[PDB]
């Protein structure tokens, strides 16, 4: 019932691959209205990432089977069932952002505000993957404002070599490519963030340099694929 053991329970659930229990423990830690630390923020992020990730993979497999092929009406039913679970997990973490995480971030906590605004844009982009009609344009405009606000804060008050800033530009380029279908806008942000990071790549931050170079490799791998 205390805060320390819920974080220990989340660590045990991670090593048992029970990411549903892990996302529930970090949800209670977040619901304690106390700002999360660096490790607690990563535990909540990793938990819901694996939860929403397993729902996206199952949705992409059912969607590919519906595309490649009395037998279809059931496939569409299994599609909407996974969509309901996917939308429920997204609206759950989005509520934790707009009520507990972002609300407890002052105008000077730039690193934490960029991380939560990127997360808000990611899970809103996840809703854009399964939404149709006006429901899509509603969550796309929400993901756009979340990524745009995070981009401006990281462009001014953050370092171009920061892994969080690079990871934001990676997901922002993915948003412009897989959602807005604008490869010009996608490769523009990826190349701009890549050039700004290479210009100061000689610093080699001793804190976490492999994490910074790994995200640049992901930016480099996306430029080769596209």
């Amino acid at each position: 019932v205390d805060r320390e053991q819920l974080v220990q329970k989340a660590r045990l659930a991670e090593q048992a691959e029970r990411y549903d229990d892990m996302a529930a423990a970090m949800k209670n830690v977040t619901e304690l209205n106390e700002p999360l630390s660096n490790e607690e923020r990563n535990l909540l992020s990793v938990a819901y990432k694996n939860v929403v990730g397993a729902r996206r993979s199952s949705w992409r497999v059912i969607s590919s089977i519906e595309q490649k092929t009395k037998k279809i009406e059931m496939v569409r039913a299994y599609r909407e069932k996974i969509e309901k679970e996917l939308e429920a997990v997204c609206q759950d973490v989005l509520s934790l952002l707009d009520n507990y995480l972002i609300k407890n971030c002052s105008e000077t906590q730039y690193e934490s505000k960029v991380f939560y605004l990127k997360m808000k844009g990611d899970y809103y982009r996840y809703l854009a993957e399964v939404a149709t009609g006006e429901k899509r344009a509603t969550v796309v405009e929400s993901s756009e404002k979340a990524y745009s606000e995070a981009h401006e804060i990281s462009k001014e008050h953050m370092q171009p070599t920061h892994p969080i800033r690079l990871g934001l530009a990676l997901n922002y380029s993915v948003f412009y490519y897989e959602i807005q279908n604008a490869p010009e806008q996608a490769c523009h942000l990826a190349k701009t963030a890549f050039d700004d990071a290479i210009a100061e790549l000689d610093t080699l931050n001793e804190d976490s340099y492999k994490d910074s170079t790994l995200i640049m490799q992901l930016l480099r791998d996306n430029l080769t694929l596209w």
């Binding site: 992020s45 990793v46 990676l170 993915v174 897989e178 694929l225």
Partner: peptide, 7 residues
């Protein structure tokens, strides 16, 4: 995916 895949 093409996004930043976390642990």
């Amino acid at each position: 995916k093409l996004s930043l895949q976390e642990r």
